[model samples]
Target: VAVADESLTAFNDLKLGKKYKFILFGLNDAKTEIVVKETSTDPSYDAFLEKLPENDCLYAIYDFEYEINGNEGKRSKIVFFTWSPDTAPVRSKMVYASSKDALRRALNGVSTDVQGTDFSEVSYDSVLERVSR
Candidate 1:
C-alpha cells in the first residue's frame, strides 16, 4: 500500500484470500499481498524495521467495495502491519483520505474546489515520513 512502499517497489504480489487478524477491518472478498524484507542497509527504511523483531512486513490490500461507475470515485484507507518469525502479526499504522470531499473532488476533477496535491499527496505523504526516516 501507499503506507508500505513509498516507491511501490519493495514487492508486488497481491492476491485474493481470507483476511488475517492483523488487518483491523477487511471486506469478505479481498485482494491482498504481503512483502517481507530482511532489514536492509538503507537507514531510512531499514531503521523502521528495527521496531520489529527480525523482518519488515508490509501489506497492501484492495478490499472489495467499489462503485459500478468506476474508481477515482473510490474512497479507501491505506493500512500497515508487520510480522516476524519470532512474533505474531501486529497492526502498525494506517492512513485515510483527508475527507470524503477531498477524494470526491479529485476523482471527479472538480477544479473549482480541488487543490492538486491536496488530494494527491495525502495518498503518499501520509506514510512517506516513516519510510523516508
Candidate 2:
C-alpha cells in the first residue's frame, strides 16, 4: 500500500478528472481496486462511457515490485494495463518505473524513450466505425 499511496499522489496531481479506473494488485495477494470517476464539473463523462467496451467498463492492473542493478541498488517498476474484454484482453497500458520522474512523465501522457515503460495507442476504430455505419 505504501508504494501505491506514493504513486497515487502523482496520479491525482495530473487531475485527469476520474475518466480512468485504477487498480493496484499483487501477484499473490487478493485483488484491490480504485475507481476514478468523472465529476459533474466535467461534461465529457458520458462520452467517455460511450467509448468503453460493450460492458462499459475498464480495468487497470498495477504490478509493483523491487529491482536491483549493479549500482542502481533497489529500484521498482509499476507496470500498468487496462483490461480488454475483447480479443487482446489488454486495451492499453501506461507503463511505469520505480522513478517518480518516470511516473510523472507517464501520467502526463508524454512519450517515453524507454521500451519497458513505453506503450503505443490501441484502437479498434476501423471495425467499430464500420459496424456503426
Candidate 3:
C-alpha cells in the first residue's frame, strides 16, 4: 500500500515539532493507501486510549512521558502502535499487518514500537515497561 503525502507531513510535524500529542492512521476506503485519520494535542494517556476502536484496526503514535526512578527529570518517548483488536474482521487485520511496514518505514523517529490485539497489551503501564527497557 502507498503512504499518502499528508500522512508523512503529519508524522513529521509530530516528530520534529511536537505539534500533536497523538495521531491515528487508517487505510483509505479503497484500501490502496494509508492516511491520517485523527490527531489530538491533548497529552492524557487515557484520552489516547479512548480513541482506539474496539473492532477496528488502526495505527497510532503517542508522545509518552514518564518519570524514571523518582528522578526529577522527566523522560519522553515517541511510541508507534499497531492496534489490531481481536474483534476486528480477519481481512482487516491482514490488511493492517501487510501494510504496516510501509508506514513504519516512513516514520523514522519513533522511539518504541508496540503491537497489540488487546487493551492490556497496549496499556500505559505495559508500554512504559517496554520503553524503559
Candidate 4:
C-alpha cells in the first residue's frame, strides 16, 4: 500500500492490516497510467457524468480509453470525493489503480472487451486509506 507522503495526500491514511476502498474496480480491459506529475482534463468526462448511461463508461486523455466492468458493469462504490494535489504541492494521487497490473493495462492503451477480478468495497476503501497514509 502507499500513503500521502509516499504517493498521495488528502487520502485518508490507512491503518495497517486494514482493507482499502476503490472508486472503480473490475476486470482488465488493460489500461494504466502512473504519472509522477502529470495532468489532463477531458471535456467528455464531465459530459458523461452529466448524462450518465445505465452501463459503464470510460474517459481518458486524448489517446486512451478503458471500459470498466465487473459486478453488473458498475463501480464497487459511489465516489466519496474527487480530489487532486493541492496548490501547496501537497502530495496526493489524482487516481490510482487497485493493481499495478490493472494500471499497466490501462496505461498501455490496449483496446479490449474483457473482465477480471472484483476488488471488494473494503479493498477499494483500503486503497484510498493507503494513498492517504
Q: Which candidate is the best by TM-score?
A: 3
Q: lDDT (0-100) at residue 96 of candidate 1? A: 19
Q: lDDT of each prediction vs. the true structure?
A: 0.26, 0.31, 0.91, 0.26
Q: Which one wins by TM-score: 1 or 3?
A: 3
Residues 1-133 of candidate 1 have per-residue lDDT tens digits of 2122321222121212223211221111221322223223232423333344332223222222222335457432223432223222333212212222222222221112112122222233434433233
Model 4 lDDT vs. the true structure?
0.26
Candidate 4, 1-133: lDDT as tens digits: 2211322221121112112222222222333332222222332333323322123322212212223435444222112212221231222222232433433333332232222122132132343343233
User: Which structure is stronger by TM-score: 3 or 4?
Assistant: 3
The count of backbone overlaps in candidate 3 is 0
* lDDT of prediction 3: 0.91
How close is each model in CA RMSD to the real structure? Answer: 17.1, 17.1, 1.3, 16.4
Model 2, 14-48: lDDT tens digits are: 33433223332211122132323221222332332
**Positional deviation of residue 10's Cα in model 4 after best superposition, in angstroms:** 26
Ranking by TM-score: 3, 2, 1, 4
Distance (Å) between predicted and true CA of 28, model 1?
A: 28
Cα lDDT, model 1, residue 121: 24
Q: Mind sharing the TM-score for model 4? A: 0.16
